[PDB]
Amino acid sequence: IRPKEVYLDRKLLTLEDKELGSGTVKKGYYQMKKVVKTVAVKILKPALKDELLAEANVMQQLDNPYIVRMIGICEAESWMLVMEMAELGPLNKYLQQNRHVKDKNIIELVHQVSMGMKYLEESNFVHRDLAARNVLLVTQHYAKISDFGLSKALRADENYYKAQTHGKWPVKWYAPECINYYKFSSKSDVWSFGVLMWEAFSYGQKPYRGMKGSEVTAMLEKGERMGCPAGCPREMYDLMNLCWTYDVENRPGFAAVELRLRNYYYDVVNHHHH
Ligand SMILES: Cc1cccc(Nc2nc(N[C@@H]3CCCC[C@@H]3N)nc3c2C(=O)NC3)c1
């Protein structure tokens, strides 16, 4: 990244004392050209510096309604990454605390995530941390994809990112090829999107509960998958299962996934109007 292009003035930023979550994320206020903009700011407490700047560099290149926009960066008390504020917070925590949210509403939100990911796929970026905790709600009917700290811009000549070693990975969201070959593609993100869908229809329950990472790998290798959440429409569980296709080449891309979700969402909108 070249800070010059996206550099913010610390004097124009006001940070809240409390933390939103955890570097650490805090609520803030940035004085824009005229309006004041409520922002979410990722702050640090050499390696961690480069990871934040890499995250900023990814976000800078993305421009989509369903992805959190970066406002800019600043080096003050630490390096800070200033982003759009999603006031209602992470999807998993929201659904845990709002069990009244309807099927149609959940379908709407996961469809928005699929539109964001279709865009990410078109742009040849891999997210590598697509989970309900990293989908943030602007409103009850507007979700954005966040948290690009593990995200990678794919090389012009390859469809995957090859990781050098097994780091601190959210293994329960990872496709077999991520675990077995360290290869991350948009198809690996589709696998993760399946788990995210399961989380959403389970009202933010953790996937594969009570199981170790190695036990999940063993379960998947036997062809076993998580069951249908209570009250989850069959069409949505069928889509989840398709996202959990073992063979990467036969697994659908986000274009196919988004189209399926889009069509089903219109069916449900029809059903509710009747
Ligand atoms: C009300 C509320 C509660 C918690 C977080 C947010 N907002 C954001 N959080 C993240 N990242 C955190 C990291 C820790 C786990 C959860 C999230 N994945 N990122 C961005 C926000 C935000 O508003 N814009 C970007 C808002």
Side-chain angles (χ1 to χ4, degrees), residues 1-17 19-274:
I1 193 163
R2 293 189 190 76
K4 181 174 168 186
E5 291 152 29
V6 295
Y7 204 88
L8 302 178
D9 188 347
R10 183 63 183 89
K11 288 197 156 60
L12 303 181
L13 183 66
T14 306
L15 290 169
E16 204 171 66
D17 294 0
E19 296 169 12
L20 296 166
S22 58
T24 193
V25 181
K26 310 189 85 179
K27 190 169 181 187
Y29 309 89
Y30 197 78
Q31 173 48 52
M32 306 284 282
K33 289 172 193 193
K34 186 185 197 163
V35 302
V36 71
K37 190 172 177 73
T38 307
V39 294
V41 184
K42 182 165 184 174
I43 310 170
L44 301 179
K45 291 167 171 161
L48 47 113
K49 168 171 166 278
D50 293 331
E51 291 179 35
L52 192 64
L53 294 169
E55 182 173 358
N57 196 232
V58 169
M59 292 187 75
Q60 183 174 12
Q61 299 174 68
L62 309 178
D63 174 27
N64 184 263
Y66 308 106
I67 295 174
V68 170
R69 301 175 188 284
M70 183 190 78
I71 308 307
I73 59 178
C74 194
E75 191 182 0
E77 57 265 27
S78 93
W79 276 103
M80 303 187 298
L81 169 54
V82 184
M83 301 167 283
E84 287 183 311
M85 179 70 213
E87 299 282 3
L88 304 200
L91 180 62
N92 63 329
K93 296 283 177 295
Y94 189 82
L95 295 170
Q96 286 164 19
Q97 303 157 231
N98 297 279
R99 302 289 180 76
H100 67 268
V101 170
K102 305 291 185 178
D103 301 312
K104 185 179 93 176
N105 197 164
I106 297 163
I107 296 159
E108 179 183 25
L109 297 171
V110 302
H111 177 232
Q112 289 166 357
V113 174
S114 81
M115 290 190 283
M117 292 307 305
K118 184 178 176 183
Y119 168 83
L120 208 67
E121 181 175 81
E122 286 165 343
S123 307
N124 299 306
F125 285 85
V126 296
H127 193 278
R128 301 183 61 236
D129 204 0
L130 183 55
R133 67 180 174 280
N134 297 331
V135 173
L136 278 40
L137 295 180
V138 173
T139 71
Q140 194 184 328
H141 305 284
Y142 186 16
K144 285 176 171 278
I145 302 155
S146 185
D147 298 273
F148 290 81
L150 291 173
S151 275
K152 303 288 171 177
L154 295 173
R155 293 162 53 112
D157 62 351
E158 292 294 326
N159 277 82
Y160 62 85
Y161 171 75
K162 177 67 166 62
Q164 288 289 111
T165 62
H166 197 294
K168 301 203 80 174
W169 288 351
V171 166
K172 289 174 173 180
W173 286 262
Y174 275 13
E177 75 274 7
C178 310
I179 306 313
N180 297 327
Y181 299 97
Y182 305 158
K183 301 212 307 190
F184 295 87
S185 62
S186 290
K187 297 297 191 71
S188 313
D189 284 342
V190 167
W191 183 287
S192 303
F193 181 74
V195 182
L196 180 164
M197 280 180 74
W198 186 95
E199 289 181 278
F201 288 97
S202 306
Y203 292 82
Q205 190 194 136
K206 293 254 185 151
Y208 306 102
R209 73 174 176 201
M211 299 180 67
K212 299 177 172 177
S214 60
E215 295 170 324
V216 172
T217 293
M219 179 188 165
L220 296 172
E221 199 166 296
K222 295 157 62 172
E224 290 182 12
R225 306 288 185 269
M226 290 187 290
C228 187
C232 179
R234 183 52 55 171
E235 293 86 348
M236 295 296 89
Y237 186 62
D238 292 350
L239 185 54
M240 281 177 223
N241 266 298
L242 195 66
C243 296
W244 306 325
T245 296
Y246 191 93
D247 184 285
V248 71
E249 300 303 317
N250 298 321
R251 192 185 306 151
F254 281 111
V257 173
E258 188 279 331
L259 185 65
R260 269 275 276 276
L261 263 168
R262 193 207 303 170
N263 289 341
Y264 191 64
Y265 180 57
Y266 302 155
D267 279 14
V268 175
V269 171
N270 185 305
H271 189 68
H272 281 56
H273 281 304
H274 287 87

